[PDB]
RNA sequence: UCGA
DNA sequence: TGCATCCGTGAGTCGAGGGACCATAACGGACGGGCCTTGTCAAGC
DNA sequence: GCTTGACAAGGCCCGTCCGTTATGGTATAATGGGAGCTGTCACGGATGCA
């Protein structure tokens, strides 16, 4: 299973994470001691949800459950036990795909990588001086212990504040002079004991309080130090903090997990002194053995911990004011601070991200992202060069290729294919045991938790092995202590289980990965997660074979579980019968809206009367073919330059891709309107709207709302809504115009929902959610109407297409089939790609892919080639050229392979009919269609809305915004002679309530006027500087007159 | 990010450098030679004049 | 282009300020007909230091350290005559280039 | 209007109240903010005293006061005797400023916590010394006269002042705390007399601290030339921003969208009304001292939040936006609203390569040109007589008639359009073009201007801008056209050149293929004889062809002047043989061995440079 | 605030509403301007027009009843046809 | 977060 | 009078997306009748 | 070409009605607050510490 960091994490929270939080919260007491409240956390209910999975997405709700615990309220003096179940909070459940539904939108919880708790030592040179060793005891939650060591044998303890001597903390926790020196070399400790005095057990708590809290008190020094490291519910090492203390310092005690042991502070000082004696290891901060990951089971444990602490303040403020008895325990627990704590984590936190649902490849990748940012991780400004590079401990755990380019280059990683996280939070990799030069591929792997660095010798999965005898190679390259070396095959210990263990699940879909560059393989893995689901997908011919596993783990593929006989198959359900209440129904969704405006259509695959197996595809998804995944189409390609139509990364396609419904996707948009409550009068949805005739009232059913199946275009009316007005401030021009022809204006105003510019399609869902029907509504709303419009988009000029090797491009021309070049059998060419971008970017694998897919086209065999071989030069060139020779041995196909030029044939011109001078490489390429279509990039504005303060035009496609003329754009016009264009762009086009009126009136009348006025943004800055206490004004230097000018008035 | 902040600092230090007059009447000069980086030359004398 | 003048007792020029080298020779030659004093040491300024020591406070506050330029301009009583670029863009007039 | 220079100075308390108090036909002025209330919760009308008051800043609606009975355009320039709101336009609210009269002086945070702390320079104190007097942590001696051991401007602790209170020396010893003592220490200064006191201390016994007296003399000399006072650095009257610069709008759900300036203004008036309440009922001095310290922290957080103390927050845990935090940052008023603005008549789209076109020409789609040139199409519709107004023209544009596209075809001819791609590194990233209406939905860009814009056809979007005035159209054509931008501004080398796909077409054309000759070694009569032989199947592209060319300016790779294989004909005529030439000397004839691909290349330069 | 598209066409409304008023009588044009508030910025009632003239009531009403009747006829008023909002 |  | 430590100042440009309680008196808008004020209708000067 | 009595329509004006709103009070005894900062790099002043 590829999703185990989400399913096993939420399963741990429902049985171990929720029980541990309620056991530490209980019991609580009052100020006097009259009654006590303790919970029973291990007997909670977790009742049934309210709505369905598909119903919660359209009703704008969350798939959540109610949490109830039994609560026993006892009293100290009077014997009474009050058992009652009290509501705790709303907990959203994880769906079957591993996601959550928050406010009708599907969301994921990205796993965040942080540092592991423990002690870490570091050699630091602050200046050109001696060698200083530092320390840092990091807990899971609480204060930090930073031990430093200066020159001349002075070890200090810093607990944010100023540093202090090591004897001050070591004596205040409770110790003797003989219990320190017996377990310490004590000759180095005499230099820090001379210039520190010699305090007793009570002569150190007073001096500790004088420097931390600057009167000292004998009772104040004990309450300050115990609350930092020794008090419960304020300092936590964690289950993994106790494990890292017993490994580094080699401690004998274990299973403490709550209180910091004072013997552990003595062991951290002893390891720091011995670092000057050239013994001990300096820890690394970028090592994956020191870096942990956490998931939904751990991140939810911190939100209930800060949510129950707010509940502890109200539970102690209600058992003291009410001095009377006979009170119910259900009124002591207020669920309001804990409901708002869970709702803030799932909807308002940064780590809960919007789920990418373009294709099943992006859904599987987004659940396995390893990001180093979040509330407790790193910062965008605090990220440096060392944290973004690849550590040598990332071999097989984190993918070195798949990472987003730009700002987050290296901070957001991806988990590898065979990687696995244990219960402690460390990434593990499987390895096969090698015994005396023989790979023992018979038993289960070892799953080493990054402990193979300083102990084991690990070989990758690329060495030639024999059939159970020995290893063929005499020099095996291995890795030992983060360095590569070639040793004997009898000296190795472990070997990798797969050659795709290093790369992730999205990089493994690229065939011939070893022939492509690592920079273009980064782009090829990112463009595969943006491919739209087509209308009829097609499986690739040069697939790697891992597409079948990624389709079943995405959750959008109906699988069988019963091993039965299929009875009834239609377009909505599949009914089988289980055998060794026997009729289950598998529902099939038809054209459901996704998050990225794509389709989630499922098609039936099986027929009636067929034996099935557990793990068989019953119904494939939208971007999924039969069994395996399918994100694009296999069509003909040719690497030849046309007449400037493929000049700089441009694509020339044919007309055959248009009328054959190739690269044709279905996009479903969703519109929203609401009949709110205006204080002047309630708004309602009517059909008789003013100033709109029969040109737009054709699809309404006398209710103001459109019908199902009506073709809407740009500028129509979906929901006709009116709004009452109470202005009554008519100008004298409109009063004279209305008095002539009559037709007195009504009190309503047309606020109908309309279709935006460049939008069309067919309406498929006109679901209306009103009150008194069984659904909750937001306050200040009478009727909520939701309109879903689906449209069928073909492939056009301006769309961005790409392949699996980073050869992205934008189509500039769609030629007919008689103008495209044609093969010597008469078959035309679909895509005419440019061969100039190939040798400059090292995209060699895309030439191996098309030449192998052309061999699979004439044979019809659908090759499955795994990456990272076999014999050198005999597995990539002679595989392609050897299989192209077999396709040429057919009696009908003799023109496929040539002896002089192997990977080339003769191509004829379509316009003139003459052959070209040189042979051209042809093949069957697998191209994808990305989400960056030409329809979403069109924006234009003449005059629209304006800003609130600066009175400048707004910015945005969805709100009719204007393009920003920034500071780099002024410097280009200032370097030109364009002074009148610069004054026009800053005055009459932005921030002038007077200059915009006269400039617009000049074009309609036909006589332009010069000299625009003062812009509004300068007068805002003039009033802001006067409010800062600065007498700033503008004057005139005219003859015998120095007067201030009034820019505002 | 380093070249963007460097370009902004070069603009504000030389934003008021406009050619206003035709001649000033100075007598100083700048001696220019062939830019030789040790053994081989990079910019010839014909490219600097 | 700037210089750090010293020994000022006749003209209101405290030792430690940065003025242009052409402006020092314009006032020294104009004071030679009367007879007075004195010395100045040349300094090399960076691209962010010479941008803040200009005659315009609007061009220096929009670049960097807005709270430091406007504090110095209010106490000294500086005046901007809108000479050069990057002021008429903020004002709303034609650039002098 | 038109101004000539901008001068900035320190605002005196008589200058701040000049902006606040306005003349009204009554006995007193009403331009003072006394209450922290903004508006009412029942109706959406403000109150008669507050930060959004109509008696101070003006009427909320156009020609309508607050109480009623004056809601017409007939009453212009009068003040209602019942309410007090002047009946005028609603645009006067963004120009009027109120003031808040304080009950205690407050030091300005820019002069105290600034660099190099000009408040502490004039007082001859330290940075921590003035910071202990302000915010009420130590006492300062204001009159140490007739005392045993006391100095001027000496800091005293809380336990040290109560010892002198038991000793009454036996004279008048005056101390002070807070900003009332700093304002008294600045008012009794000697700025005319202290300037000559520091000048005699520089020449005599300078030492290392000569620069300290020099830096102090620069601050004192600025207060005499500007005719300012040293006591104006403390604030007694606080100015108020106009209410449209702190807008309060209501969203669709009913919630109000307030600003952070309203929460910082309310903290000043709530702590000022409490200080006037404690000073009236004779409060204990430990409560009045704590109230004046919070009034000092409320104004300093209003001016520069987080400068001296801790940053105050609101409902959300982010930092509040103060008066200084809207001008200094990258998202401030200077770098986001003055140097760079969002312009009208603009748009953007993806770009595709347009071949079979020219330079200074770009592909412009029809639905984007009808929005950018919308005031130019409407003017042509009324001029041709199709419509009569804008409402008849705008309904005809959005309808989709084929006569509208014939009007748009006649408008864009000769109208330059500036194309722009972000980021703009050099000045050739903004060039003007003459657009044409093409089929599709992308901008057909020329492939020759691609190294100029640094544009690649894999997802690049370019911004479109349209000029309006007649002077802007003549500057985009004569100075910003793409045909006049061949040379780069950095070097003297051109950038309009064949780069990727046309170099490979010219390298293969003038190459040498030693296998596909098909008729090499043939003599042709001139340049035009070889072009007529390429249209037939006579010669190939790389055939060795002798061409009779009488010109001498023939450049080639590895040129030579020596004559090898000298052959002499009859009657004294000698043939001068070369590596690539064949000259008949006595020059009679001259044959050039070349390829027909080099003749097509040399013919293209002849028809382009000679017109 | 109002968009400049409604403020520009408000100025174009003055150029066409005063065009059909110049073709009327100078006495007939003076009644319609001061009544609705043209060229003064203030709306005046019917009795204030009768006190600056030497003619009493029931004449200004029937003049405006005659002025509004001739503008409704389709004669020399074809430009005030698509102004109905 | 994602494109250049 | 020179050497450490701390604090304040900067760190690319465009576009898309999503997102406690109660008692009592003062204050003010709403409702209703009276009073001119204003618009309209049919003949008669 | 204008003029006069008649018939309602409606805006202010001035009373009261009751919801709305500002103000003061309650008597066992109660007596110093929480919530993060701990992985950025470079330069320029300003203390302060010998
Ligand atoms: Mg590009
Ligand atoms: Zn009024």
Interface of C with A (CB under 8 A): 70, 74, 85, 89-95, 97
Q: Among A981, C12, A713, which residue's Cα sits nearest to residue D475?
A: A981
First to last CA, chain C: 22
Q: Among A140, A101, A148, which residue's Cα sits nearest to residue A121?
A: A148
Cβ proximity of D443 and D430 under 8 Å: no
Contacts of A459 (CB under 8 A, 6+ apart): A434, A476, A477, A478, A492, A494, A495, A496
How many Å apart are CA A209 and CA A168, to the nearest integer?
Answer: 11
Domain boundaries, position A180: 115-294
**Tokens read off for B46:** 């014909």
**What is the phi/psi pair of residue A415, to 5°?**
-75, 150
Helix and strand numbers, DSSP H then E, in chain A: 24, 50
Chain A nearest CA to D316, separation (Å): 12
**What is the phi/psi pair of residue A740, to 5°?**
-75, -60
Q: Encode D132-163 in three state secondary structure.
A: HHCCCCCEEEEECCCCCCCCCCCEECHHHHHH
Strands across the sheet containing C40-42 = C18-20, C2-5, C40-42
Alpha carbon of D294 to those of A136, A882, A1029: distances in Å? 39, 87, 20
Cβ proximity of A932 and D459 under 8 Å: yes
What is the CA E33 to C1' G39 distance in angstroms? 19
Q: Among D453, D452, D451, which residue's Cα sits nearest to residue D462?
A: D453
Chain C nearest CA to D110, separation (Å): 7
**Tokens read off for D212:** 């300290």
Closest ligand to D461 CA?
1
Using CA coordinates, name the residue in chain E closest to D390. E9
D window 121-140: Cβ near strand F (< 7 A): none
Judged by DSSP in three states, A781 sits in strand
First to last CA, chain E: 20
How many Å apart are CA D443 and CA D362, to the nearest integer?
Answer: 7
| Burial of residue D610 (number of CB atoms within 10 Å: 0-12, 13-18, 19+) | exposed
Q: Which helix (H) or strand (E) holds A513?
A: none
Contacts of D47 (CB under 8 A, 6+ apart): D35, D37, D38, D39, D40, D53
Q: What is the DSSP letter of D296?
A: H
Contacts of A373 (CB under 8 A, 6+ apart): A112, A350, A379, A380, A411, A412
Cβ proximity of C9 and C37 under 8 Å: yes
First to last CA, chain D: 54
What is the CA D42 to C1' H9 distance in angstroms? 33
Cβ proximity of A2 and A366 under 8 Å: no
Q: Which is it for the CA torsion D423, D429, D431, D437, positive or negative?
A: negative
What are the b/e assignments for A930-959, b being 16+ CB within 10 Å? bbbbbeebbbbbbbeebbebbbbbeeeeee
Using CA coordinates, name the residue in chain B closest to C45. B13
Task: Determine if residue A244 is left, alpha or beta; phi over 0 gives left, psi from -120 to 50 gives alpha, anything else beta.
Answer: alpha
**What is the phi/psi pair of residue D218, to 5°?**
-75, -30
CB atoms within 10 A of CB A139: 17
Contacts of D126 (CB under 8 A, 6+ apart): D120
| Burial of residue A214 (number of CB atoms within 10 Å: 0-12, 13-18, 19+) | exposed
Q: Closest CB to E68: pick one of A731, A739, A743.
A: A739
- 3-state percent breakdown (helix, strand, coil) of chain A, nearest 5: 25, 25, 50
What are the b/e assignments for A480-517, b being 16+ CB within 10 Å? beeeeeeeebeebbbbbbbbbbbbbbbbbbbbbbebbb
Q: Among D313, D268, D257, D309, which residue's Cα sits nearest to residue D291?
A: D268
Q: How far is CA D242 from the centre of its chain?
A: 23
Task: Determine if residue C16 is left, alpha or beta; phi over 0 gives left, psi from -120 to 50 gives alpha, anything else beta.
Answer: left
Q: Which is it for the CA torsion A772, A776, A780, A783, positive or negative?
A: negative
Pairing of strands A939-941, A711-712: unpaired
CA angle at residue A745 from A739 to A748, to 5 degrees? 170
E77 chain-D contacts, CB cut-off 8 A: none
User: What is the whole-number distance in angstroms between the Cα of residue D457 and the centre of ligand 1?
Assistant: 6
What are the b/e assignments for D339-359, b being 16+ CB within 10 Å? bbbbbbbbbbbbbbbbbebeb
Q: What is the DSSP letter of A531?
A: P
Q: How far is CA A907 from the centre of its chain?
A: 46
Q: Is D362 annotated as a binding residue?
A: no
Q: Among A923, A935, A627, which residue's Cα sits nearest to residue A803?
A: A923
Contacts of D262 (CB under 8 A, 6+ apart): D38, D51, D246, D248
Q: Which long-range contacts (CB under 8 A, 24 or more apart) does E43-50 make?
A: E43/A732, E43/D72, E43/D73, E43/D74
E7 CB within 8 Å of a chain A CB = yes
Alpha carbon of A923 to those of A829, A832, A847, A872: distances in Å? 10, 11, 8, 24
Q: How far is CA D225 from the centre of its chain?
A: 34
Chain C nearest CA to B24, separation (Å): 13
**What is the phi/psi pair of residue D508, to 5°?**
-75, -25
How many Å apart are CA A130 and CA A858, to the nearest integer?
Answer: 74
Asked if strand F contacts A404 at the CB level, meaning under 7 A, the answer is: yes
How many Å apart are CA D171 and CA D154, to the nearest integer?
Answer: 18
How many Å apart are CA A284 and CA A125, to the nearest integer?
Answer: 16
How many Å apart are CA D462 and CA D192, to the nearest integer?
Answer: 63
CA angle at residue A389 from A386 to A393, to 5 degrees? 100
**What is the phi/psi pair of residue D577, to 5°?**
-90, 145
Alpha carbon of D90 to those of A439, A737, D62, D85, D95: distances in Å? 86, 26, 5, 12, 10
Across the interface, whether the CB atoms of A1021 and D379 are under 8 A apart is answered no
Pairing of strands A809-815, A650-654: parallel
Alpha carbon of A954 to those of A944, A950, A951, A989, D341: distances in Å? 8, 10, 9, 12, 10
How many Å apart are CA D117 and CA D121, to the nearest integer?
Answer: 7
How many Å apart are CA D378 and CA D384, to the nearest integer?
Answer: 10
Helix axes C66-76, D210-225, angle to 10 degrees: 70
Q: Which nucleotide is nearest to E62 (CA to C1')?
A: G40
E37 chain-A contacts, CB cut-off 8 A: 732, 735
Within D37-193, residue ranges assigned H as helices are: 54-57, 109-112, 118-122, 127-133, 158-166, 179-187
CA angle at residue A502 from A501 to A503, to 5 degrees? 100
Whichever domain contains A248, its CATH number is 3.90.1110.10
E1 CB within 8 Å of a chain A CB = yes
What is the CA A324 to C1' G20 distance in angstroms? 17
Task: Determine if residue A811 is left, alpha or beta; phi over 0 gives left, psi from -120 to 50 gives alpha, anything else beta.
Answer: beta
Q: Among D231, D290, D288, D238, which residue's Cα sits nearest to residue D264?
A: D238
Q: What is the dihedral of CA A250, A255, A261, A267, to 10 degrees?
A: 0
How many Å apart are CA C16 and CA D217, to the nearest integer?
Answer: 11
Alpha carbon of A131 to those of A148, A150, A278, A672: distances in Å? 11, 9, 12, 66
Cβ proximity of D355 and A643 under 8 Å: yes
The size of the C-D interface in CB pairs under 8 A is 78
Alpha carbon of A223 to those of A207, A787, D188, E72: distances in Å? 14, 63, 51, 94
Structure method: cryo-EM
For the residues of D300-312, what is the DSSP string, one character each?
HHHHSTTSSSPPP
First to last CA, chain B: 34
Helix axes D374-384, D390-397, angle to 10 degrees: 110
Q: What is the dihedral of CA A410, A411, A417, A422, to 10 degrees?
A: 140
Pairing of strands A632-639, A617-620: unpaired
Alpha carbon of D31 to those of A1033, A1044, D213, D277, D592: distances in Å? 21, 22, 44, 22, 96
CA angle at residue A416 from A411 to A422, to 5 degrees? 95
Across the interface, whether the CB atoms of C89 and A1015 are under 8 A apart is answered no
**Tokens read off for A963:** 């393009």
Q: Is B24 annotated as a binding residue?
A: yes
Judged by DSSP in three states, A549 sits in helix
Strands across the sheet containing A146-150 = A146-150, A154-158, A164-165
Cβ proximity of C86 and D9 under 8 Å: no
Judged by DSSP in three states, D472 sits in helix
Chains touching A (3+ CB pairs < 8 Å)? C, D, E
Contacts of A531 (CB under 8 A, 6+ apart): A358, A359, A361, A623, A631, A632, A928, A929, A930
Whichever domain contains A743, its CATH number is 2.40.50.150
What is the CA E25 to C1' H4 distance in angstroms? 27
The residues facing D229 across adjacent strands are none
Q: What is the DSSP letter of A731?
A: -
The residues facing A791 across adjacent strands are A667
CB atoms within 10 A of CB D360: 19
Contacts of D268 (CB under 8 A, 6+ apart): D100, D238, D295, D298, D299, D302
First to last CA, chain A: 72
């Amino acid at each position: 299973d590829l999703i185990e960091i989400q399913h096993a994490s939420f399963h741990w929270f429902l049985e171990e994470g929720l029980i541990e939080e309620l056991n530490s919260f209980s019991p609580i007491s009052d100020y006097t001691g009259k009654l006590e409240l303790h919970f029973l956390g291990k007997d909670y209910k977790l009742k049934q949800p309210k709505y369905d999975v598909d119903e919660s997405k359209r009703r704008d709700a969350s798939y959540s459950v109610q949490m109830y615990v039994p609560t026993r309220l006892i009293n100290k003096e009077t014997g009474e036990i009050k058992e009652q179940e009290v509501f705790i909070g709303d907990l959203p459940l994880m769906t079957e795909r591993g996601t959550f539904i928050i406010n009708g939108a599907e969301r994921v919880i990205v796993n965040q990588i942080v540092r592991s708790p423990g002690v870490y030592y570091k050699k630091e040179l602050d200046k050109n001086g001696r060698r200083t060793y530092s320390a840092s005891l990091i807990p899971n939650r609480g204060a930090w212990l930073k031990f430093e060591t200066d020159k001349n044998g002075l070890v200090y303890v810093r607990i944010k504040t100023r540093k202090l001597s090591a004897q001050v903390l070591l004596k205040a926790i409770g110790l003797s002079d003989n219990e320190i020196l017996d377990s310490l070399h004590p000759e180095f400790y005499q230099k820090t004991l001379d210039k520190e005095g010699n305090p007793t057990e009570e002569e150190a708590l007073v001096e500790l309080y004088k420097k931390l809290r600057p009167p000292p008190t004998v009772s104040g020094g004990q309450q300050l130090l115990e609350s930092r490291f020794f008090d419960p519910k304020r300092y936590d090492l964690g289950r993994v903090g106790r494990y890292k203390l017993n490994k580094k310092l080699r401690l004998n005690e274990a299973d403490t997990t709550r209180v910091l042991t004072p013997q552990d502070i003595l062991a951290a000082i002893n390891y720091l002194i011995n670092l000057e004696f050239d013994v001990g290891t300096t820890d690394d901060i970028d090592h994956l053995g020191n870096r942990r990951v956490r998931s939904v089971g751990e991140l939810l444990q911190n939100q209930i911990r800060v949510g129950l602490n707010r509940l502890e303040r109200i539970i102690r403020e209600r058992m003291t004011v009410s001095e009377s008895d006979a009170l119910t325990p259900a009124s002591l627990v207020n669920p309001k601070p804990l409901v708002a704590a869970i709702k803030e984590f799932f909807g308002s936190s940064q780590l809960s991200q919007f789920m990418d649902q373009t294709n099943p490849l992006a859904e599987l990748t987004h659940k396995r992202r390893i990001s180093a940012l979040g509330p407790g991780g790193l910062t965008r400004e605090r990220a440096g060069f060392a944290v973004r590079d690849i550590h040598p401990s990332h071999h097989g755990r984190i993918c070195p290729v798949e990472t987003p380019e730009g700002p987050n280059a290296g901070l957001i990683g991806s988990l590898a294919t065979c990687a696995r996280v244990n219960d402690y939070g460390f990434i593990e990799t499987p390895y096969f045991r090698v015994e005396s030069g023989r790979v023992r591929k018979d038993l289960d792997p070892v799953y080493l938790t990054a402990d193979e660095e300083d102990d084991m010798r690990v070989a990758p999965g690329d060495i030639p092995t024999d059939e159970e005898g020995n290893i063929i190679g005499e020099s095996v390259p291995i890795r030992y202590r983060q360095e590569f070396s070639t040793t004997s095959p009898e000296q190795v210990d472990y070997v990798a289980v797969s050659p795709v263990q290093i790369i992730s699940v999205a990089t493994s879909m690229i065939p011939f990965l070893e022939h492509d560059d690592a920079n273009r393989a980064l782009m090829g893995s990112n463009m595969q997660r943006q491919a739209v689901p087509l209308l009829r997908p097609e499986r690739p011919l040069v697939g790697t074979g891992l597409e079948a596993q990624a389709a079943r783990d995405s959750g959008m593929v109906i699988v069988s579980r019963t091993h039965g006989i299929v009875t009834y198959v239609d377009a909505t359900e599949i009914r089988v019968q289980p055998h060794s209440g026997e009729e289950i129904v598998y529902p099939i969704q038809k054209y459901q809206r996704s998050n990225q405006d794509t389709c989630l259509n499922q098609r039936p695959l099986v027929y009636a009367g067929e034996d099935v197996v557990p793990g068989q595809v019953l119904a494939d998804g939208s971007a999924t073919e039969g069994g395996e995944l399918a994100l694009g189409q296999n069509i003909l390609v040719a690497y030849m330059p046309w007449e400037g139509y493929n000049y700089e990364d441009a694509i020339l396609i044919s007309e055959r891709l248009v009328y054959d419904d190739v690269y044709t996707s279905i996009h479903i948009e969703k519109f929203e309107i609401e009949a709110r409550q205006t204080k002047l009068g309630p708004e309602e949805i009517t059909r008789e709207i003013p100033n709109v005739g029969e040109d737009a009232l054709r699809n309404l059913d006398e209710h103001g709302i459109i019908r199902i199946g009506a073709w809407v275009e740009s500028g129509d009316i979906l929901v006709g809504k009116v709004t009452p007005k109470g202005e009554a401030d008519q100008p004298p021009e409109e009063k004279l115009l209305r008095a002539i022809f009559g037709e007195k204006a009504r009190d309503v105003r047309d606020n109908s929902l309309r279709v935006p510019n460049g939008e069309k399609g067919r309406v498929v869902d006109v679901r209306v959610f009103t009150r008194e029907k069984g659904d909750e509504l937001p306050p200040g709303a009478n009727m909520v109407v939701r309109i879903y419009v689906a449209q069928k988009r073909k492939i056009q000029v301006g769309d961005k297409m790409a392949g699996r090797h980073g050869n992205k491009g934008i189509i500039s021309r769609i030629l007919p089939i008689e103008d495209m070049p044609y093969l010597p059998d008469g078959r035309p060419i679909d895509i005419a790609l440019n061969p100039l971008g190939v040798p400059s970017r090292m995209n060699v694998g895309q030439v191996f892919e098309c030449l192998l897919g052309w061999a699979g086209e004439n044979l019809g065999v659908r090759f499955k080639i795994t990456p990272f071989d076999m014999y050198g030069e005999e597995a990539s060139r002679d595989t392609v050229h050897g299989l192209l020779e077999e396709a040429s041995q057919r009696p009908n196909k003799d023109w496929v392979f040539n002896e002089n030029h192997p990977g080339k044939i003769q191509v004829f011109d379509g316009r003139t009919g003459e052959p070209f001078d040189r042979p051209i490489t042809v093949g069957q390429a697998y191209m994808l269609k990305l989400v960056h279509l030409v329809d979403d990039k069109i924006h234009a504005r003449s005059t629209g809305p304006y800003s609130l303060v600066t009175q400048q035009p707004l910015g945005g496609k969805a709100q009719q915004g204007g393009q920003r003329f920034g500071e780099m754009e002024v410097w280009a016009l200032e370097a030109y002679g364009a002074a009148y264009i610069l004054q026009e762009l800053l005055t009459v086009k932005s921030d002038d309530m007077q200059g915009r009126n006269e400039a617009l009136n000049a074009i309609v009348k036909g006589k332009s006027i010069p000299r625009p006025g003062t812009p509004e943004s300068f007068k805002v800055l003039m009033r802001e500087l006067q409010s800062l206490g600065l007498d700033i004004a503008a004057h005139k230097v005219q003859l015998s007159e120095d007067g201030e000018s009034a820019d505002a008035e | 990010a380093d070249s963007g902040y460097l370009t902004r600092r070069l603009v504000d230090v030389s934003q008021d450098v406009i050619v206003r007059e035709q001649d000033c009447g100075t007598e100083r000069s700048l001696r220019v030679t062939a830019m030789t980086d040790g053994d081989q030359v990079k910019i010839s004398l014909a490219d600097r004049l | 282009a700037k210089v750090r003048i010293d020994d000022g007792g006749d003209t209101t020029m405290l030792p430690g300020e940065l003025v242009e080298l052409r402006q020092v020779e314009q006032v020294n030659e104009a004071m030679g007909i009367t007879g007075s004093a004195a010395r100045y040491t040349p300094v090399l300024l960076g691209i962010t230091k010479a941008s803040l020591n200009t005659d315009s406070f609007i061009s220096a506050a929009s670049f960097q350290e807005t709270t430091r330029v406007l504090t110095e301009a209010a106490i000294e009583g500086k005046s901007d005559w809108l000479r050069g670029l990057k002021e008429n863009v903020i004002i709303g007039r034609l650039i002098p280039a | 209007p038109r101004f000539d220079y901008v001068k900035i100075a320190i605002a005196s308390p008589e200058r701040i109240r000049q902006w606040g108090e306005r003349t009204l036909p009554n006995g007193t002025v009403v331009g003072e903010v006394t209450k922290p209330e903004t508006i009412n919760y029942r109706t959406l009308k403000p109150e008669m005293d507050g930060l959004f008051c109509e008696k101070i800043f003006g009427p909320s609606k156009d020609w309508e006061c607050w109480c009623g009975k004056y809601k017409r355009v007939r009453h212009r320039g009068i003040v209602c005797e019942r309410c007090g709101v002047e009946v005028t336009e609603s645009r006067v609210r963004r120009h009027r400023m109120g003031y808040i009269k304080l009950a205690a002086p407050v030091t300005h945070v820019w002069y105290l916590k600034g660099i190099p702390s000009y408040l502490s320079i004039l007082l001859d104190m330290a940075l921590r010394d003035v910071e202990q007097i302000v915010y009420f942590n130590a006492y300062v001696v204001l009159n140490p006269g007739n005392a045993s051991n006391l100095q001027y401007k000496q800091l005293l602790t809380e336990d040290q002042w109560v010892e002198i209170e038991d000793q009454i020396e036996l004279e008048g010893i005056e101390v002070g705390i807070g900003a009332e003592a700093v304002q008294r220490l600045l008012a009794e200064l000697q700025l005319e007399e202290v300037a000559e006191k520091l000048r005699e201390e520089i020449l005599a016994s300078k030492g290392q601290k000569r620069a300290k007296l020099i830096k102090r003399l620069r601050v004192i000399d600025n207060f005499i030339a500007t005719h300012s006072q040293a006591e104006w650095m403390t604030l007694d009257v606080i100015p108020v921003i106009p209410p449209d610069l702190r807008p309060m709008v209501q969203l669709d759900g009913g919630r109000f969208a307030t600003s952070d300036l309203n929460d910082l203004y309310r903290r000043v008036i709530n702590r000022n009304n409490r200080l006037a309440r404690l000073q009236e009922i004779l409060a204990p001095e430990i409560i009045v001292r704590n109230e004046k310290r919070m009034l000092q922290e409320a104004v300093d957080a209003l001016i520069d939040n987080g400068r001296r103390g801790r940053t105050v927050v609101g409902a959300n845990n982010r930092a509040l936006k103060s008066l200084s935090d809207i001008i200094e940052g990258k998202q401030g008023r200077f770098r986001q609203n003055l140097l760079g603005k969002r312009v009208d008549y603009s748009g953007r789209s993806v770009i595709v390569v347009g071949p079979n076109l020219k330079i200074y020409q770009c592909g412009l789609p029809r639905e984007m040109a009808i929005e950018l040139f919308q005031p130019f199409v409407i003017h042509r519709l009324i001029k041709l007589g199709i419509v009569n107004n804008i409402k008849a023209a705008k309904k005809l544009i959005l309808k989709g008639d084929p006569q509208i596209w014939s009007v748009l075809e006649e408008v864009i001819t000769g109208h330059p359009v500036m194309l722009n791609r972000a980021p703009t590194l050099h000045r050739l990233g903004i060039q003007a073009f003459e657009p044409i209406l093409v089929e599709g939905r992308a901008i057909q860009l020329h492939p020759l201007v691609c190294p100029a814009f640094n544009a690649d056809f894999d997802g690049d979007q370019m911004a479109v801008h349209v000029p309006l005035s007649l002077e802007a159209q003549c500057e985009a054509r004569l100075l910003m056209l793409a045909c006049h931008n061949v040379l780069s501004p950095a070097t003297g080398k051109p950038i309009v050149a064949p780069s990727q796909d046309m170099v490979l077409g010219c390298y293969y054309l003038t190459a040498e293929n030693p296998n596909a000759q098909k008729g090499a070694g043939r003599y042709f009569a001139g340049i035009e004889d070889a072009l007529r032989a390429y249209d037939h199947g006579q010669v190939d592209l790389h055939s060795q062809i002798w061409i009779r060319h009488l010109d001498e300016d023939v450049v080639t790779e590895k040129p030579d002047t020596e004559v090898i294989k000298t052959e002499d004909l009859g009657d004294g005529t000698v043939m001068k043989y070369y590596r690539e030439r064949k000259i008949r000397e006595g020059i009679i004839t001259q044959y050039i061995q070349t390829t027909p691909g080099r003749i097509i290349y040399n013919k293209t330069i002849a028809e382009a440079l000679v017109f | 605030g109002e968009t400049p598209e409604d403020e520009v066409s408000k100025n174009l409304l003055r150029e066409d509403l005063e065009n059909v008023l110049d073709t009327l009588s100078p006495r007939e044009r003076d009644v319609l301007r001061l009544r609705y508030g043209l060229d003064d910025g203030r709306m005046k009632t019917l009795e204030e027009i009768g006190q600056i003239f030497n003619v009493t009531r029931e004449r200004i009403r029937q003049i405006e009843a005659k002025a509004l009747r001739k503008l409704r006829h389709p004669n020399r008023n074809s430009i005030l046809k698509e102004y109905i909002r």
